[PDB]
């Protein structure tokens, strides 16, 4: 069973690296959101004020379900781990 | 201990599936960001140019802390794995 231990260890380490990469993607995503906010706040709003629809509901619904699936998988992971103590 | 091996294997596989689902959520998120950028760049900016605040600091701070927590948990995961070699 020593090889099984070695393989699980390597598998866990690769899982953790994948998680690190998603975290980085999220930080980069915020930078993009802030960049867009920046341009709107710096140029679009001031110009309109001097002079004086966006429908993504289907996309947000798709994202909500995808995130929920992630929850369903983690919950199942935890159930299996409880069987180790016995 | 054979059952413990089987349970850890199943638990790891479910963890990996949850990671895949988060990746998909992130790709969909970018599609949404690009869609919004698209409408701004295609209609809002051109119209204002022909004619011629957004405060989310508290939300971004909340996201930064949540992402940091993810880092704190992975670091702890790695510390435990080092105890396997002994």
């Amino acid at each position, epitope marked *: 069973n020593a090889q099984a231990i070695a393989n699980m260890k390597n598998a866990i380490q690769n899982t953790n690296e994948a998680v690190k990469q998603l975290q980085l993607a999220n930080k980069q995503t915020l930078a993009v959101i802030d960049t867009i906010r920046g341009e709107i706040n710096n140029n679009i709003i001031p110009v309109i004020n001097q002079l004086s629809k966006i429908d993504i509901g289907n996309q947000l619904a798709g994202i909500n379900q995808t995130l929920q699936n992630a929850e369903d998988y983690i919950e199942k992971s935890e*159930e*299996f781990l*409880k069987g180790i103590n*016995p | 201990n054979a059952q413990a091996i089987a349970n850890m294997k199943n638990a790891i596989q479910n963890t990996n599936e949850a990671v895949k689902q988060l990746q998909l959520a992130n790709k969909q998120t970018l599609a949404v960001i690009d869609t919004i950028r698209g409408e701004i760049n295609n209609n809002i900016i051109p119209v204002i140019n022909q004619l011629s605040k957004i405060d989310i600091g508290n939300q971004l701070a909340g996201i930064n802390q949540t992402l940091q927590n993810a880092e704190d948990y992975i670091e702890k995961s790695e510390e435990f794995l080092k105890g396997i070699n002994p």
Partner: antibody
Amino acid sequence: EVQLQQSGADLVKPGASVKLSCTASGFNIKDTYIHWVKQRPEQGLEWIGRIDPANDNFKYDPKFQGKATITTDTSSNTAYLQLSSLTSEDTAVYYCASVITTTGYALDYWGQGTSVTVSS
Amino acid sequence: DIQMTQSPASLSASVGETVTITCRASGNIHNYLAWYQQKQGKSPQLLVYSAKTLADGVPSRFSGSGSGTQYSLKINSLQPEDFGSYYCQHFWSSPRTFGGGTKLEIK
């Protein structure tokens, strides 16, 4: 061996509160999930909900979310189902069930069930 | 949510006959389906889990298979002791509900 010993035989008036319970033998409550199921006399089975005694993490079928709650006492290896606002429909048989060997797949052990009735 | 449909309301068969019970899902269960049996009284017991397996102690007379949203149970060479009520439920996400159930009688 592993078993669930369920108890109760509550005869109550409409509007009454009822507490049903089960105890474990042969295993530690902390290492398992406890589920509750409601069987109306002739109408199949409805899942109520379950708890994780390790951290009192509960989850319920929305149908009973405002009807009943599930709690536990780890130190005595026991579990409880608290029913409120009992009416005629609630007359039924409740079962305590747990997952022992078939982890992640199916309810394994069941209690004998407890019957609670509501009458004037 | 994900609901289960137990199609046969009631089956009627003599001893030695082969019958089947079919169960369908309103969504993808990822093969986390289990079958239970109950007598006229007493608690139910687990017969098949993971929808492709047998529970410990269960006779080879009981088997099953399926995928996606379509699953089934088969009972070969029915014996007098095999007559009772059958149920299907899933263990994916929540709520982990049950199908209506099928009653198999001797006749």
